[PDB]
Structure 1
């Protein structure tokens, strides 16, 4: 199965659906159907009835409908290396943007046992904490088990980072990634965005209010950022499809990112 088809169908693009048709034709020895037989994305495909499937493909619609129900009942397992890599791409993006937007002087990285900075080039004092630091990095990690009930009065300067570190309740000055609600009362959900400050370069147009780049100030995204935006969205979808969600301090404002230009 192609990588995108390992995502929940709600995330499949119009192109992913046509590759699903092609994969199923060979896996199940079906009569070839025209690639434009289901000209829609996965969100739309999930709204069709079985009768609609049968009308659009008299020779295989019912099989395809039932195949989709099986895919929907038993989601395909994901590849840890790809998922891990997708998460780390999102972590760098989000934390970089937060530091640029709000200029925190300190970052308190809670649950980081390897003392690795996800944004090594930011102008910020990086502090690491973990309940069980890796023995080869404990010399620069504070041994600490975070609980809101014990530490809510601490780490009040700068921002706190809880990247997949499940604690009882997150403090208000936090950036959080959680794997699957009272823990999040101090925060808000982080909606998708893409931010980049790399140089624009030319050589399908991208229309998106969430592409925060200099070239999108005027609505004419360059080829380079269009490509990087699509690659980033694929990584984001892989992480969200796998059960991760992102939460952020309530003052996080994407207009602070636009103002960097």
Structure 2
């Protein structure tokens, strides 16, 4: 139970308009053979070109929706569409390119996949809504064989060059012409009634249908993401480290402690309502406040209605208007005015944030989290939280070459007294780096309108 058996049955109804007369009884073994590929019984890490839903979810960073539309089947040109928005036209002789032979088209496919995937994944997973032409066109740009390594590094081989007879990963494939050992999954195999557009539109209004192959490719990957990350969630799946995951997560913990500690000192709320992660611990353990936790799992479809988070059935709910409410990555439609909020901005461009369903995004950092679309109106009762650094720690060095720190946002006893000490200057610079790391990763901070750092200076007396 690791790979998809080649002898698994493949439902062929979706393929019969492009391939009339196709047998209803069909295996992956026979389908692959029909596509022009010879597996010759090989136990070398590539048992099937097709993979299970579970293997696809483990490799979501590799997903590339692919669709082929028969413009005019050997004698006709084909429109090759990708979920990157690219449309290529291959002639047998929203970025739309004119008709070119396969020998040049395949060089473009390798360039595009390599640039899109080199910082995301060790492979490609073609996400299909298979009708026939996409499967039969694969032989014109795909080569298969045993698992291999790059000619220039230790990464697995994803590309092949006929000019040099060598193999490369996504980082070293410049000038390569063939996709090597790609994987693929047919979304139609999951049991769907009706066509791609009708199933996609049930959950998403952001992707339209301009009737080009890239629109179908985008809709296909969108629908796959809804099925695997929106309606079905698995937070037990671990994903590899591809970027600043560790620094971002450490920054988030530093920022949360800083902001919450400062809010409690400036406004002295008697009670804090910590709403979100059922596994959460107190971010400011030494604070005076009555800390009360409320469980809400990360919402992956629509943002929580604030009224449902306070809904208590036949009993009285806790008083949310007393003290402060802390929503650390707990996505609601409209935050109460007495809130401290961290909300991920789904629009952020990064290697951790993949395009999602209905304006939302799939943020992949250790775990995959489909996040609802960022909506500025959720924050109408609050203001953006400005950067500040606060510290009550003693002015002592212990144990880097100096330029004295001058900043109005270094809230320390030394700055109050006229001159920032070396320890607080080092800590301020580290904290500003962590803050910038967290912000550039996509997180946004919001706070109740009465929040004022001027109230922190009198904590030094």
Q: What SS does the corresponding residue of 2:200 show, helix, strand or coil?
A: coil
Query: CA 1:4/1:159 → structure 2, altered by over 3 Å: closer, same or farther?
Result: farther
* Contact map agreement 1:133 1:141 (CA 8 A) in 2: no
Q: TM-score when scaled to structure 2?
A: 0.36
> Which string of whole-angstrom CA distances, capped at 9 and with x for unpartnered residues, describes residues 161-209 of structure 1?
0011110110000000111911000000011000000001257100000
Structure-1 separation of matches of 2:278 and 2:251 = 20
2:255 alignment partner in structure 1:
90
Structure-2 separation of matches of 1:89 and 1:193 = 12
Structure-1 separation of matches of 2:416 and 2:259 = 20
Q: What SS does the corresponding residue of 1:226 show, helix, strand or coil?
A: helix
Q: 2:416 aligns with which of 199, 208, 217?
A: 217
Structure-2 separation of matches of 1:131 and 1:51 = 26
In the TM superposition, residue 244 of structure 1 has moved relative to its aligned partner by 0.8
Query: CA 1:45/1:175 → structure 2, altered by over 3 Å: closer, same or farther?
Result: farther
In the TM superposition, residue 222 of structure 1 has moved relative to its aligned partner by 0.3
Give the structure with the higher percent strand: 2
1:59 alignment partner in structure 2:
200
* Contact map agreement 2:412 2:424 (CA 8 A) in 1: yes
* Contact map agreement 2:3 2:47 (CA 8 A) in 1: no
> Which string of whole-angstrom CA distances, capped at 9 and with x for unpartnered residues, describes residues 62-112 of structure 1?
xxxxxxxx9999999632222111111000000000001111110000113
Alignment of 1:1-16 (within 5 A): none
Query: CA 1:240/1:47 → structure 2, altered by over 3 Å: closer, same or farther?
Result: farther
Query: CA 1:145/1:90 → structure 2, altered by over 3 Å: closer, same or farther?
Result: same
2:392 alignment partner in structure 1:
197
Structure-2 separation of matches of 1:225 and 1:4 = 54
Q: In structure 2, list runs of 5 or more residues that go unmatched.
A: 5-43, 56-196, 202-210, 213-236, 345-374
* Contact map agreement 1:172 1:249 (CA 8 A) in 2: yes
Deviates further, 208-217 or 180-189: 180-189
* Contact map agreement 2:254 2:434 (CA 8 A) in 1: yes
Structure-2 separation of matches of 1:102 and 1:57 = 52
Q: What SS does the corresponding residue of 1:258 show, helix, strand or coil?
A: helix
* Contact map agreement 1:130 1:143 (CA 8 A) in 2: no
Q: 1:229 aligns with which of 392, 415, 428?
A: 428
In the TM superposition, residue 251 of structure 1 has moved relative to its aligned partner by 0.2
* Contact map agreement 1:131 1:143 (CA 8 A) in 2: no
Query: CA 1:123/1:132 → structure 2, altered by over 3 Å: closer, same or farther?
Result: same
Q: TM-score when scaled to structure 1?
A: 0.62
Deviates further, 143-152 or 165-174: 143-152
Q: What SS does the corresponding residue of 1:142 show, helix, strand or coil?
A: helix
In the TM superposition, residue 58 of structure 1 has moved relative to its aligned partner by 56
* Contact map agreement 1:128 1:141 (CA 8 A) in 2: no
Query: CA 1:79/1:128 → structure 2, altered by over 3 Å: closer, same or farther?
Result: same
In the TM superposition, residue 132 of structure 1 has moved relative to its aligned partner by 4.0
* Contact map agreement 1:108 1:129 (CA 8 A) in 2: yes
Give the structure with the higher percent helix: 1
Structure-1 separation of matches of 2:199 and 2:296 = 60
Query: CA 1:255/1:74 → structure 2, altered by over 3 Å: closer, same or farther?
Result: same
Query: CA 1:81/1:143 → structure 2, altered by over 3 Å: closer, same or farther?
Result: farther
Q: Larger RCO: Structure 1 or Structure 2 (Cα < 8 Å, ≥ 6 residues apart)?
A: 1
Query: CA 1:241/1:151 → structure 2, altered by over 3 Å: closer, same or farther?
Result: farther
* Contact map agreement 2:277 2:297 (CA 8 A) in 1: no
In the TM superposition, residue 116 of structure 1 has moved relative to its aligned partner by 0.4
In the TM superposition, residue 149 of structure 1 has moved relative to its aligned partner by 17
In the TM superposition, residue 130 of structure 1 has moved relative to its aligned partner by 1.6
* Contact map agreement 2:272 2:290 (CA 8 A) in 1: yes
Q: 1:100 aligns with which of 235, 258, 265?
A: 265
Count of residue pairs the alignment pairs up: 213
In the TM superposition, residue 114 of structure 1 has moved relative to its aligned partner by 1.0
* Contact map agreement 2:270 2:290 (CA 8 A) in 1: yes
* Contact map agreement 1:114 1:137 (CA 8 A) in 2: no
